[PDB]
Amino acid sequence: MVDAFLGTWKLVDSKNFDDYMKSLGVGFATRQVASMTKPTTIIEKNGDILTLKTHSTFKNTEISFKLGVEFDETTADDRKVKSIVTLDGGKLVHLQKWDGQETTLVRELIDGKLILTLTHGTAVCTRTYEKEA
Numbered sequence: 001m002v003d004a005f006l007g008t009w010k011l012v013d014s015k016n017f018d019d020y021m022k023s024l025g026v027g028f029a030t031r032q033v034a035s036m037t038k039p040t041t042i043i044e045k046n047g048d049i050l051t052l053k054t055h056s057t058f059k060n061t062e063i064s065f066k067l068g069v070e071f072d073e074t075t076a077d078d079r080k081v082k083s084i085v086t087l088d089g090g091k092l093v094h095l096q097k098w099d100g101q102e103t104t105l106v107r108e109l110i111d112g113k114l115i116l117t118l119t120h121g122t123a124v125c126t127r128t129y130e131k132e133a
């Protein structure tokens, strides 16, 4: 049910990521660097537990979770959030909540590419990842 998302993915396109980061309050110097970074995202499962790694020259993150079970997360920009990841319409939907705020990170597969849509406030960012062999 998560199976086609699994593997190693490389960023190959990004739209409106600065808008998204700015909406979250990320400072200008961090946004510079992030705008030029091409992370690698690794999605692995072991039974019911998924692990999602994001690696770059700037920041690294790792989360582990079961689908449909809330978990604590500390994001790349140091927000302490309550998170849940589910499958919805075949999309992997990650919802983060903190301070009454929310942001969604939605992943879907289109033509074999992994499209990540990030929404916070009115900002909508679309990042495209391609699978590494």
Ligand SMILES: CCCCCCCC(=O)O
Pocket (backbone or CB within 6 Å): 011, 021, 024, 039, 041, 054, 075, 076, 077, 116, 127
């Ligand atoms: C720093 C803002 C929060 C995380 C951004 C995730 C981007 C990505 O995985 O391509």
